[PDB]
């Protein structure tokens, strides 16, 4: 019975439709624990600057 | 394997899986374990190539 390994552990992402204006910050980033500083993606649907 | 493909055959008899129509390995490396398994079935595992 074939068994598989995966990605999502090593790659995950989350995307926000903005409301209410404000919203200058985003808390916990993705749900729990730590984001890793070295690699950054912020996308406006343009991928925001480094 | 890849290039000129494999052709694996459970001929009539007891299916490898599902249709039993010959399953063909175009996967470059591959390793094969299928057993005769009580539901007349030959289970080989997800083209593990090493």
Swiss-Prot record, chain B:
It is found in: Virion. Induction: Expressed in the late phase of the viral replicative cycle. It comes from the Viruses. Transmembrane segments: none annotated. Signal peptide: none annotated. Homotrimer; disulfide-linked. Heteromultimer with gp7; a gp10 molecule is disulfide-linked to gp7 and the other two remaining gp10 molecules form a disulfide bond. The gp10 trimer interacts with gp11 trimer and with the short tail fiber (STF) composed of the gp12 trimer. Part of the baseplate macromolecular complex which consists of gp5, gp5.4, gp27 (central spike complex); gp6, gp25, gp53 (inner baseplate); gp7, gp8 (intermediate baseplate); gp9, gp10, gp11, gp12 (peripheral); gp48 and gp54 (proximal region of the tail tube). Peripheral baseplate protein that is part of the tail fiber network. Connects the short tail fibers to the baseplate. During infection, the baseplate undergoes a conformational change from a dome-shaped to a star-shaped structure. At this point, gp10 rotates and acts as a lever that unfolds the short tail fibers, which then interact with host cell surface receptors. Involved in the tail assembly. Belongs to the T4likevirus baseplate wedge protein gp10 family. This is Baseplate wedge protein gp10.
